[PDB]
């Protein structure tokens, strides 16, 4: 019952920006161009490449592919998801206000709360799953609304089209959607009214746990010009080698995301029927409080499954010590299954009282379900839960 | 007559941080670890690696080597020299003031003037080659003094020890020296009183025109803690692949820099006796106005030579069209000889009236003398100057 | 109606040999170790790494993963499929005889016919699709039988179990199956009686058209010892960087091969009903003469589809000029759709009279169907065939 | 008193084959093109790239640079020095004879003695430092003479011009010189009458202990055609990534080799005056028995120094356990100083009686002197020798 799949996604992921005719060799795969500089025909010629930080063949090719997958006219790549977040925030100026989704990646929270707030920006954290709370938080000084959906790590949704309608009633507010948890294959925020589609390509977009990278996609020529200026001027740019590996990852994005959905749904159903589990959170389950919204704004669901184990922190620790296929590690969106305890790991920097309000408790486990055989994943979770609750 | 050479530099560049015992394999060369994440023995363990952006084996190994070469306790790597500049600026807060050397890389000028200044920072450009002008510009709100020496692109010097003495009479002012043009082999700002030694590793430190990277070295544990927080929280981090290539470049840094000095001095002497050249600028020539200061604060001089061609922009254009070994291109500090026209290329973003005051005229040519045979370089410059002025 | 799928394949492709505990860092992804050499605790210690050609961490990790996917105890990697072929041939000696499948890759034919035959080896080409012809060609001097199934490029099959039974009635004959066209996911020659499973990892195993590599898998400890001696002594070894990229490719092998099968079957059915096509060859179609054998010895079929266009070479040339999604290029098994004319390209070195006997005519087109959207692939073939035959 | 230095070597190492005009981007540094295949304008077009094993942009660019440095018209790259040796041996046929220098790398000995000899080739090991022994070993069946000079590991020389005159009195004998120990910077066998200049680029040519590679340089169009056929048909080809790193290494070859000579000469003089050393071998010392020949056929000497420690294997082991800057490890020609015991390590495969005849005793230590500070290297050797002989 999800939105129908993007129909040319796999074709675009393989071909857009990848014409062999652009290379002297007619290579069918884009070259890795490491050169920092490029010979000019005359001083300050306005065409061709000039300096790697400003633009380079491998990065420019990746940006064309990602733009197509995000349904965007323009894409910019960065050294990390947090570097993308920093660059977007530099669109503003002293005196501006940001509204941020109350539950975000701990590093996003840390950046807004401890860094951006020291340079004349006012930050408010608001539960944007309730559109009336977003409506009430907007002031004439609001210039940016930052929403993750689903949220890291409790997988709360925001209605992107409903939030876009609220913010676009006001003059000059940018809506950013952090699309990291869904990927371009399952959610397209620019088609739902977002002004900026941002993600940590570190996760599903690259998909191989071997690249740290941020991606920012826009339709606005004004936002493109302002962001291009900052990509060049702050210089938080990715290695061309990383651009190559991320481009290589995109070639399998459609088939990886379909497998993450099959495995994720099987894990979520398994946990929901296991008596050692207090509560499962997966947007693809009917039990998710926003399951109907997920079907209205997504084409499917990835491999992110969160659950509350029965008991206390001690039981969560025993579960995470006994997993043998899932690895206790940070990150998500790789081919390999990962598990973490957000309260002690990714969200340790979020104040304890804020974690309590958000439901980031000492029994919340976040799973990133990989591409392994379903039966092997369910046997691993089963035996680890039995070790925690004999 | 320069300061005596650093005596263990080549040994440290090859061995510091490179112990084979730290690798399971006992590899004599550091591995490239691309992994974004690392398996933990228990949740939030305080030791080992956690997440690539926060720290990773290849980057941490490079940072240990660069720290030793800069005479520093601590080193941080960034996605670019401009990302290093952005990260250092985030040490401050709204209401603080920066004093910047009046002549800097065009991108540094653009960042301070057009970006940092919009986030509650006051920026003043001061000729820090005159220590009384630096003294007079300091206010109680000054928190950062940013000096390049020699300057890009007219190779003006600042007396680092004299500037350090002035800023350290006040409470809580950070002195940054951008050491890009000298390299760690020829100038050690932390030994002359700088608080931060910054460079674009894109240039001499890597030396192979195939890595964009920034390096920041400090002795202060307070500055290390604040900068480490921002490396992690802004996420302007380098690829581990780029860290490997930069580490590979450091292994030849001493012998490259000695050859840049031999070739640079030969080019400067050749241009100084050529009647088609109005004026040569090279800190190693007795004709440089600050030659005596260069000998007091450096162990030598690299391959950066600037000159004013006789005549007009038309003659500069004909010279740059006729060079056949030197390539018309941005960047510097590579094995390959490069030439540019800063007024139209690297410094085009600096307002025309500011270029005029700084001496960045339409006849100023910046050379980066590479590692080619001296006779081939002198014949190339000779025939190109003859094409401009028969 | 194919053999049932390998059930732990995806789990093994992700986990076998990839334990984080083997790395000092506990990296969840294998490091790229470029080091040529490794520090020894004492001279000629028998444990640990010694010299990259003899063995190295990245290559040894890939070999463990491939061995599991081939159902093998041992795997050896080489610089190319042809280097694997050369190394296997060096198992023999002057006076030995090789029987080779009559239709093989042009380069395999060239190696046996023009190179191996000059070093005291007698080569006979035999149609091993007819087991009585194999039986009749074996002499007391036969030491190696080399079979490709399906064959490059007309996709003829050999009954591996039936050929194994024939050769194993004799003393000391090695049966090699070149598994390049099926991949480890769809065919397991070691489980059907082959002594050696060889492939060009250049094709499906890597799957991203960015690595040239050969793989050889065995169960015999004797063959492992003899081949390991030759991997080290001929030195036709892969780069650790290439081993990393091939390992990265294996992580998606199961889901890529399932998509190649869906797309390949759709293309084959489309060509079979198109009146501009003389004849389609696809082992998954009931029309293939050996369709029933394919179902008895394989778990599916990949994306290799061959067809004879109606008319002459001129029509084949017009088809190959008008394809806009398929690219005219050598190779196969990549994510991108490729087309070639074997008589003029891959099999040009095979004598014209031998091409005629094998059915490698000037109207035979070989397609490698990639991972693009099925509808886009069928529209591209349709419009190109219409350009050839209005 | 050595031959005068090659005068354009550094210019050629940086520029030959590296024209920015050949790249669409005008990159000043060659791109890494990993593509296995290349789009053709029509089937079997005779120009452009076709298939990575047959030729590719990065490898072809490296081959142009190495050809210039070897004074050759043609260069071919291979997966290793041993793969280059295997490929050259495939120039022959059953019934041909090879004469090999009696002292060679252990792996070269193993290949000729245990592998090539099984394919109808007769191998004779001859002390080619005595030209009358070479003259007497030649028969009408001799087709190849293989000489290393200086030899691995006792640094015996052969007079290349005198050996060339002897073999070229006969019809159709190829003289190969393995130039690994000298590098192209110090010895040019093609200018002294060799038909083939071969080396392990694993050592000095790459110089960074991170690439395994073989290089073969020729002037003959006949040898080029025959070797090109075998590079393509045996497929023992290097990764384009390895070709890039080797090309990057060549940019510093001149300055690295000059430093290896300064450090190597200082180490040799230090060992020659140390009472814990029985005998030092270094071609640059007047004490070397062939010092006068070294000055007639080389432009200098690299960092390879061999010595016999006083006493027994126990003293050699204590020396190799106490070195703290030199590392006990195989290989040579890197920036890092290495030491090995050839009798137990590189030459363990050579029969014990052959080692005795050649002087490869249990007290022979081979040093590869790196690019560290001279004083640090002499202090390390001094303290390690004192640990062995208090
Ligand atoms: C929704 C979302 N947005 C941005 C980022 C930052 O991206 P980067 O790390 O590329 O700077 C992340 C990182 N999450 N990492 C984790 O949750 C973990 N480390 O496990 C995120 O989850
Ligand atoms: C003194 C100095 N500091 C910092 C940077 C920025 O470093 P990055 O480019 O790594 O962000 C540069 C760049 N110079 N580039 C040139 O002058 C050219 N592009 O020719 C610089 O010269
Ligand atoms: C069945 C089979 N076995 C071995 C090889 C050699 O492998 P390598 O090229 O890695 O040395 C190939 C190459 N085929 N390439 C093509 O058909 C093309 N070039 O289109 C093959 O098809
Ligand atoms: C003179 C000479 N020629 C060829 C090779 C083989 O090259 P490759 O290793 O690239 O196949 C070597 C290797 N020597 N390695 C050593 O001496 C060591 N392993 O210490 C050699 O020394």
Coordinates of C-alpha atoms in Angstrom, one line a residue, chain A:
Chain A
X1 CA 0.0 0.0 0.0
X2 CA 3.0 2.4 -0.3
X3 CA 3.3 5.0 -3.1
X4 CA 4.2 3.4 -6.5
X5 CA 8.0 2.9 -7.0
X6 CA 10.1 5.5 -9.0
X7 CA 10.0 3.8 -12.5
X8 CA 13.3 5.0 -14.2
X9 CA 15.4 5.1 -10.9
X10 CA 17.8 2.2 -11.8
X11 CA 18.3 3.5 -15.4
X12 CA 19.1 7.0 -14.0
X13 CA 21.4 5.7 -11.2
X14 CA 23.5 3.9 -13.9
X15 CA 23.4 6.4 -16.9
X16 CA 22.8 10.0 -15.8
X17 CA 26.0 12.0 -16.1
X18 CA 27.9 8.8 -17.1
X19 CA 28.1 9.3 -20.9
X20 CA 31.3 7.7 -22.2
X21 CA 31.6 10.5 -24.9
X22 CA 32.7 13.0 -22.2
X23 CA 36.0 11.1 -21.6
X24 CA 38.9 11.1 -24.2
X25 CA 39.2 7.3 -23.6
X26 CA 35.4 6.7 -24.0
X27 CA 35.7 4.7 -20.6
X28 CA 32.2 3.2 -19.8
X29 CA 33.0 3.9 -16.0
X30 CA 33.9 7.4 -14.8
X31 CA 37.7 8.0 -14.1
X32 CA 39.0 9.0 -10.7
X33 CA 40.6 12.4 -11.4
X34 CA 42.8 13.3 -8.4
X35 CA 44.4 16.4 -10.0
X36 CA 44.1 19.5 -7.8
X37 CA 44.5 21.7 -10.9
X38 CA 43.8 22.0 -14.7
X39 CA 45.7 23.7 -17.5
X40 CA 43.9 26.8 -18.8
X41 CA 44.0 27.9 -22.5
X42 CA 44.2 31.6 -21.2
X43 CA 44.1 33.2 -17.8
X44 CA 40.7 33.1 -16.0
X45 CA 38.9 31.3 -18.9
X46 CA 35.2 31.0 -17.7
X47 CA 34.8 27.3 -19.0
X48 CA 36.4 24.0 -18.0
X49 CA 37.9 23.0 -14.6
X50 CA 40.1 25.4 -12.6
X51 CA 40.7 24.0 -9.1
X52 CA 39.6 20.7 -7.5
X53 CA 37.9 22.4 -4.5
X54 CA 35.7 24.5 -6.9
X55 CA 34.8 21.5 -9.1
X56 CA 36.4 18.4 -10.6
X57 CA 35.3 15.8 -13.1
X58 CA 34.6 12.9 -10.7
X59 CA 32.6 15.0 -8.1
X60 CA 30.7 16.8 -10.9
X61 CA 29.7 13.4 -12.4
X62 CA 28.4 12.1 -9.0
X63 CA 26.5 15.4 -8.4
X64 CA 24.6 14.9 -11.8
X65 CA 23.6 11.3 -10.8
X66 CA 22.4 12.2 -7.3
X67 CA 20.4 15.2 -8.6
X68 CA 18.5 12.8 -10.9
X69 CA 17.8 10.3 -8.1
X70 CA 16.6 13.2 -5.7
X71 CA 14.3 14.6 -8.5
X72 CA 16.5 17.8 -8.3
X73 CA 18.0 20.3 -10.8
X74 CA 21.1 20.7 -8.6
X75 CA 23.2 18.6 -6.2
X76 CA 26.2 19.5 -4.0
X77 CA 28.5 17.0 -2.3
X78 CA 30.3 17.5 1.1
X79 CA 33.0 15.8 3.2
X80 CA 30.2 14.4 5.6
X81 CA 26.5 14.8 6.5
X82 CA 27.5 17.1 9.3
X83 CA 29.6 19.2 6.8
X84 CA 26.4 19.4 4.6
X85 CA 24.5 20.6 7.8
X86 CA 27.2 23.2 8.6
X87 CA 27.2 24.5 4.9
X88 CA 23.3 24.8 4.8
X89 CA 23.4 26.7 8.2
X90 CA 25.8 29.2 6.6
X91 CA 23.0 30.2 4.2
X92 CA 21.7 32.3 7.2
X93 CA 23.2 35.2 9.1
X94 CA 23.3 36.6 12.7
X95 CA 19.8 37.4 14.0
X96 CA 18.1 34.4 12.1
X97 CA 16.2 31.6 13.8
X98 CA 16.3 27.8 13.1
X99 CA 13.5 25.4 14.0
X100 CA 14.8 21.8 14.3
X101 CA 12.9 18.6 14.7
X102 CA 13.1 17.7 18.5
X103 CA 14.5 14.3 17.8
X104 CA 17.6 14.3 15.4
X105 CA 20.9 12.5 15.1
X106 CA 22.9 13.4 18.3
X107 CA 25.6 15.2 16.2
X108 CA 23.0 17.4 14.5
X109 CA 21.6 18.3 18.0
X110 CA 25.2 19.0 19.2
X111 CA 26.0 21.2 16.1
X112 CA 22.8 23.4 16.4
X113 CA 22.8 23.5 20.3
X114 CA 26.5 24.0 21.0
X115 CA 28.1 25.6 17.8
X116 CA 25.5 27.4 15.5
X117 CA 23.8 29.0 18.5
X118 CA 27.2 30.8 19.4
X119 CA 27.2 32.7 16.0
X120 CA 24.0 34.7 16.4
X121 CA 21.5 32.0 15.4
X122 CA 18.6 31.1 17.7
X123 CA 17.8 27.4 17.7
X124 CA 14.4 25.9 18.9
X125 CA 13.7 22.2 19.0
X126 CA 10.0 21.4 18.1
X127 CA 8.0 18.2 17.7
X128 CA 7.2 18.6 14.0
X129 CA 5.2 15.4 14.0
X130 CA 2.5 17.8 15.4
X131 CA 2.0 20.5 12.7
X132 CA 0.3 22.9 15.2
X133 CA 3.5 23.0 17.3
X134 CA 5.5 23.9 14.1
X135 CA 2.9 26.6 13.2
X136 CA 3.2 28.2 16.7
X137 CA 7.1 28.2 16.8
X138 CA 7.4 30.2 13.5
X139 CA 8.4 33.9 14.1
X140 CA 9.3 36.7 11.6
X141 CA 13.0 35.8 12.3
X142 CA 12.6 32.1 11.3
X143 CA 14.7 31.4 8.2
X144 CA 15.2 27.6 8.3
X145 CA 13.1 24.6 9.4
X146 CA 15.2 21.4 9.7
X147 CA 13.2 18.1 9.7
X148 CA 14.5 14.4 9.8
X149 CA 11.8 11.9 8.9
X150 CA 11.9 9.2 10.1
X151 CA 13.9 10.5 13.1
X152 CA 17.2 9.0 14.4
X153 CA 16.7 6.8 16.4
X154 CA 13.0 6.4 17.4
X155 CA 11.7 6.5 13.7
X156 CA 9.0 9.2 14.3
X157 CA 7.6 10.7 11.1
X158 CA 6.8 14.3 10.0
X159 CA 4.2 14.9 7.2
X160 CA 6.6 16.7 4.8
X161 CA 3.8 18.1 2.5
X162 CA 1.8 19.4 5.6
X163 CA 5.1 21.0 7.1
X164 CA 5.9 22.5 3.6
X165 CA 2.4 24.1 3.4
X166 CA 2.9 25.7 6.9
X167 CA 6.4 27.1 6.3
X168 CA 5.6 28.3 2.7
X169 CA 2.7 30.5 4.1
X170 CA 5.5 32.7 5.5
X171 CA 8.1 34.7 3.4
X172 CA 11.6 33.4 2.9
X173 CA 11.7 30.2 5.1
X174 CA 13.8 27.3 3.8
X175 CA 12.4 23.8 4.6
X176 CA 15.3 21.1 4.8
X177 CA 14.4 17.4 5.0
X178 CA 17.2 15.1 6.1
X179 CA 16.4 12.0 4.0
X180 CA 19.3 9.8 5.4
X181 CA 17.0 7.1 6.9
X182 CA 14.8 6.5 3.8
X183 CA 17.3 7.0 0.9
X184 CA 16.3 8.7 -2.5
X185 CA 14.7 5.3 -3.5
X186 CA 11.9 5.4 -0.8
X187 CA 11.3 9.1 -0.2
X188 CA 11.6 12.2 -2.4
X189 CA 11.2 15.4 -0.2
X190 CA 11.6 17.8 -3.2
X191 CA 8.5 16.3 -4.7
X192 CA 6.6 16.9 -1.4
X193 CA 7.5 20.6 -1.0
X194 CA 10.9 20.6 0.7
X195 CA 13.3 23.4 -0.5
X196 CA 16.5 21.2 0.3
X197 CA 16.9 17.4 0.4
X198 CA 20.0 16.6 2.5
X199 CA 21.4 13.3 3.4
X200 CA 24.4 11.5 5.0
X201 CA 25.6 9.5 1.9
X202 CA 27.7 7.7 4.6
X203 CA 24.6 5.5 5.1
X204 CA 22.4 3.9 2.4
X205 CA 23.4 6.1 -0.7
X206 CA 26.9 4.7 -0.7
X207 CA 25.7 1.6 1.2
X208 CA 29.2 -0.1 1.7
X209 CA 30.3 1.5 5.0
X210 CA 33.5 2.9 3.4
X211 CA 32.7 6.5 2.5
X212 CA 31.9 9.5 4.8
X213 CA 30.0 12.0 2.6
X214 CA 27.1 14.5 2.6
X215 CA 24.7 15.3 -0.3
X216 CA 22.4 18.4 -0.7
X217 CA 19.9 18.5 -3.6
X218 CA 17.8 21.6 -4.6
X219 CA 15.5 22.9 -7.4
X220 CA 15.9 26.7 -6.6
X221 CA 18.6 28.4 -8.8
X222 CA 19.0 31.0 -5.9
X223 CA 19.7 28.2 -3.3
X224 CA 22.0 26.5 -5.8
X225 CA 24.1 29.7 -6.3
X226 CA 24.2 30.4 -2.5
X227 CA 25.2 26.7 -1.6
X228 CA 27.8 26.5 -4.5
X229 CA 29.4 29.7 -3.1
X230 CA 29.7 28.0 0.3
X231 CA 30.9 24.6 -1.0
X232 CA 33.8 26.5 -2.6
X233 CA 34.3 29.1 0.2
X234 CA 34.1 26.8 3.4
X235 CA 35.8 24.0 1.4
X236 CA 34.1 21.1 3.2
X237 CA 34.5 19.1 0.0
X238 CA 34.8 15.3 -0.6
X239 CA 37.8 13.4 -2.1
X240 CA 37.3 12.5 -5.8
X241 CA 38.1 8.9 -4.6
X242 CA 35.2 9.0 -2.2
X243 CA 33.0 10.5 -5.0
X244 CA 34.0 7.4 -7.2
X245 CA 33.1 4.9 -4.4
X246 CA 29.8 6.7 -3.7
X247 CA 29.0 6.7 -7.5
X248 CA 29.8 2.9 -7.5
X249 CA 27.4 2.4 -4.5
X250 CA 24.5 4.3 -6.4
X251 CA 24.7 1.6 -9.2
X252 CA 23.1 -1.0 -6.8
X253 CA 21.0 1.4 -4.7
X254 CA 17.6 0.2 -6.0
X255 CA 18.3 -3.5 -5.5
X256 CA 20.0 -2.9 -2.1
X257 CA 17.0 -0.8 -0.8
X258 CA 14.5 -3.5 -1.9
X259 CA 16.5 -6.1 0.0
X260 CA 16.8 -3.8 3.1
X261 CA 12.9 -3.5 3.0
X262 CA 12.4 -7.3 2.8
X263 CA 14.9 -8.0 5.6
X264 CA 13.7 -5.0 7.7
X265 CA 10.1 -6.1 7.5
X266 CA 11.0 -9.7 8.4
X267 CA 13.1 -8.5 11.5
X268 CA 10.3 -6.1 12.6
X269 CA 7.6 -8.9 12.4
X270 CA 10.0 -11.3 14.3
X271 CA 10.6 -8.7 17.1
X272 CA 6.9 -7.8 17.3
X273 CA 5.9 -11.5 18.1
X274 CA 8.9 -12.1 20.5
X275 CA 7.9 -12.0 24.3
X276 CA 11.4 -10.6 25.2
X277 CA 10.6 -7.4 23.3
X278 CA 8.6 -4.6 25.0
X279 CA 7.8 -2.6 21.8
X280 CA 9.0 -2.6 18.1
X281 CA 9.2 0.6 16.0
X282 CA 9.1 0.1 12.2
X283 CA 7.2 2.5 9.8
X284 CA 6.3 -0.6 7.6
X285 CA 4.4 -2.3 10.5
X286 CA 0.7 -1.5 11.0
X287 CA 1.5 -1.1 14.7
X288 CA 3.7 2.0 14.0
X289 CA 1.5 5.1 15.1
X290 CA 2.3 6.8 11.7
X291 CA 2.0 3.8 9.4
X292 CA -0.7 5.4 7.3
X293 CA 1.4 8.6 6.8
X294 CA 4.4 6.4 5.8
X295 CA 2.3 4.8 3.0
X296 CA 1.1 8.3 1.9
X297 CA 4.7 9.9 1.6
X298 CA 7.1 6.9 0.9
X299 CA 7.4 4.1 -1.7
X300 CA 8.6 1.6 0.9
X301 CA 10.7 1.3 4.1
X302 CA 14.4 0.6 4.6
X303 CA 16.2 -1.7 7.2
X304 CA 16.1 0.6 10.2
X305 CA 14.2 -1.2 13.1
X306 CA 14.2 0.1 16.7
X307 CA 12.9 -1.8 19.7
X308 CA 12.7 -1.6 23.5
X309 CA 14.0 -4.8 25.1
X310 CA 12.1 -6.0 28.2
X311 CA 13.8 -5.2 31.5
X312 CA 16.7 -2.7 32.1
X313 CA 20.0 -1.5 30.6
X314 CA 21.5 -4.8 31.9
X315 CA 19.3 -6.8 29.5
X316 CA 20.2 -4.4 26.6
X317 CA 23.9 -4.9 27.4
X318 CA 23.6 -8.7 27.5
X319 CA 21.7 -8.7 24.1
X320 CA 24.4 -6.5 22.5
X321 CA 27.2 -8.7 23.9
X322 CA 25.5 -11.9 22.5
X323 CA 24.7 -10.9 18.9
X324 CA 27.1 -12.8 16.5
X325 CA 25.9 -11.6 13.0
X326 CA 24.7 -8.1 13.9
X327 CA 27.8 -6.2 15.1
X328 CA 27.8 -3.7 18.0
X329 CA 28.9 -0.6 16.1
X330 CA 27.8 2.9 15.2
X331 CA 26.4 3.8 11.7
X332 CA 23.7 2.3 9.5
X333 CA 22.7 1.7 5.9
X334 CA 25.5 -0.7 5.1
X335 CA 25.3 -4.2 3.6
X336 CA 26.3 -5.6 7.1
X337 CA 23.8 -5.7 10.0
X338 CA 24.6 -3.3 12.9
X339 CA 23.2 -2.7 16.4
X340 CA 23.7 0.1 18.8
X341 CA 22.3 1.6 22.2
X342 CA 21.7 5.2 21.2
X343 CA 21.4 6.5 24.8
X344 CA 25.1 5.5 25.5
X345 CA 26.5 5.7 21.9
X346 CA 25.1 8.0 19.1
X347 CA 22.9 10.2 21.4
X348 CA 25.2 10.2 24.5
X349 CA 25.8 14.0 23.9
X350 CA 22.0 14.8 24.1
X351 CA 21.1 15.8 27.8
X352 CA 19.7 12.9 29.8
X353 CA 16.4 14.8 30.5
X354 CA 16.0 15.5 26.7
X355 CA 16.6 11.7 25.9
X356 CA 13.9 10.9 28.5
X357 CA 11.3 13.3 26.8
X358 CA 12.2 11.8 23.3
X359 CA 12.0 8.1 24.4
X360 CA 15.8 7.5 23.9
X361 CA 15.8 5.3 27.0
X362 CA 18.5 2.9 28.3
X363 CA 16.4 -0.1 26.8
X364 CA 16.1 1.4 23.2
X365 CA 18.2 -0.6 20.7
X366 CA 18.6 0.7 17.1
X367 CA 19.1 -2.0 14.4
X368 CA 20.4 -1.4 10.9
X369 CA 19.3 -4.6 9.0
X370 CA 21.8 -5.4 6.2
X371 CA 21.6 -7.7 3.1
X372 CA 22.3 -11.1 4.8
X373 CA 19.9 -14.1 4.5
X374 CA 16.7 -13.4 6.5
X375 CA 16.8 -16.8 8.4
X376 CA 20.4 -16.1 9.7
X377 CA 19.3 -12.6 10.9
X378 CA 16.2 -14.0 12.8
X379 CA 18.3 -16.8 14.4
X380 CA 20.9 -14.2 15.6
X381 CA 18.3 -11.9 17.2
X382 CA 16.5 -14.9 18.7
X383 CA 19.6 -16.4 20.4
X384 CA 20.7 -12.9 21.6
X385 CA 17.3 -12.1 23.1
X386 CA 17.3 -15.6 24.8
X387 CA 20.7 -14.8 26.4
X388 CA 19.2 -11.6 27.8
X389 CA 15.9 -13.3 29.0
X390 CA 16.4 -17.0 29.4

